[PDB]
Design a protein around this ligand. Structure first.
Ligand code: NI
Length: 341
């Protein structure tokens, strides 16, 4: 049974609610982004209308085989009518194709559903600027002040500089980057660009990347591993055993691996600056955990909410425990008292 925080009152609509069977009263299922916790339940046998971005619709058709007649892609930043209700899709600054959804209810209420997002001051100049929002359905993944991490640009600067230094010292070093979903493509693309290489990967991953409308992608990635000095592997393989095993397969072309695990936040963030990050090493293998986030920091979240000034907040993450819920409600009230709304 579908939980309340996935239902949009006053409409026939649900958000990210595909794992509950046929939801009573739902005439249109929105999908914010192509991450498995959110698409859970979708398949080629789905026969209701799914509304989403173009990129998400490429992935539904090619990876999950949803039939084309049920996929309804909408352009961003454009007022659209769906089943009698005005909606807008906004870039969520999450993974490729991820959106926030603005719903303009028939009774005059305006609802923003962030999906998963990384708040940014650039959102203060989208179509959000033009009117009041009554209810905010908020990605609260990192809603606690201990959650600090650097900008995505500082993280990429560290990775490029690290990779270019290592391979220039040793031209026989291979770079490996872990992945288990879409998002964080800038990590492996920026490293391959500095090294003058394409990124090598499995056929299944190449297919996924080909759905993402990235400019000049055919110039950047390949399935020919032998021709590439930046390889992508499943995240589960980014450990000393998996990397040893991979180095064997490269036929003595390489004698060292430098690997990257983009994580979200890890508690090494409470003490250490990005500049000061060091790897775990065993022999000729080094592994860096880098804090590349596609969710808001606590401070970025707070800034967005204090600018938006919603009348009510409904969290969509960390909702399963009473301690979590009570923590989040306390920060919402601080924020509102501090800013005066
Ligand atoms: Ni996500």
């Amino acid at each position: 049974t579908c939980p309340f925080y996935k239902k949009i009152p006053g409409t026939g609509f649900t958000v990210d609610a595909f794992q509950y069977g046929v939801v009573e009263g739902c005439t249109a299922y929105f999908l914010t982004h192509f991450h498995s916790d959110h698409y859970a339940g979708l398949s080629k046998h789905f026969t209701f209308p799914v509304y989403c971005s173009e990129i998400t619709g490429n992935l539904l058709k090619n990876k999950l085989h949803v039939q084309e007649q049920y996929i309804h892609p909408l352009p961003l930043d454009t007022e659209c009518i769906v089943n009698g209700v005005k909606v807008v899709l906004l870039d969520a600054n999450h993974c490729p194709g991820a959106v926030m959804i603005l719903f303009y209810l028939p009774n005059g209420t305006v609802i923003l559903h962030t999906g998963d997002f990384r708040a940014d001051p650039s959102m203060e100049r989208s179509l959000l600027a033009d009117q009041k929002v009554h209810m905010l359905y908020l990605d609260t993944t990192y809603c606690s002040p201990e959650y600090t991490f650097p900008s995505q640009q500082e993280v990429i600067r560290f990775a490029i500089n690290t990779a270019f230094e290592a391979v220039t010292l040793n031209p026989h070093a291979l770079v490996v980057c872990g992945t288990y979903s879409i998002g964080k493509e800038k990590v492996f693309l920026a490293i391959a660009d500095v090294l003058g290489s394409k990124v090598g990967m499995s056929q299944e991953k190449y297919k996924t990347l080909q759905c993402l409308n990235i400019p000049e992608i055919n110039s950047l990635i390949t399935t020919d591993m032998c021709s590439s000095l930046v390889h992508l592997l499943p995240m589960m393989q980014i450990n000393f055993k998996g990397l040893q095993s991979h180095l064997k397969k490269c036929g003595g072309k390489y004698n060292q691996i430098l690997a990257f695990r983009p994580t979200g936040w890890t508690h090494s963030n409470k003490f250490t600056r990005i500049a000061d990050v060091i790897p775990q090493t065993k022999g000729n293998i080094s592994i860096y955990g880098i804090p590349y986030s596609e969710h808001s920091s606590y401070l970025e979240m707070k800034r967005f909410v204090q600018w938006l000034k919603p009348q009510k907040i409904i969290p969509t993450v960390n909702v399963g425990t009473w301690k979590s819920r009570s923590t989040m409600e306390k920060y919402f009230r601080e924020w509102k008292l501090e800013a005066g709304y």
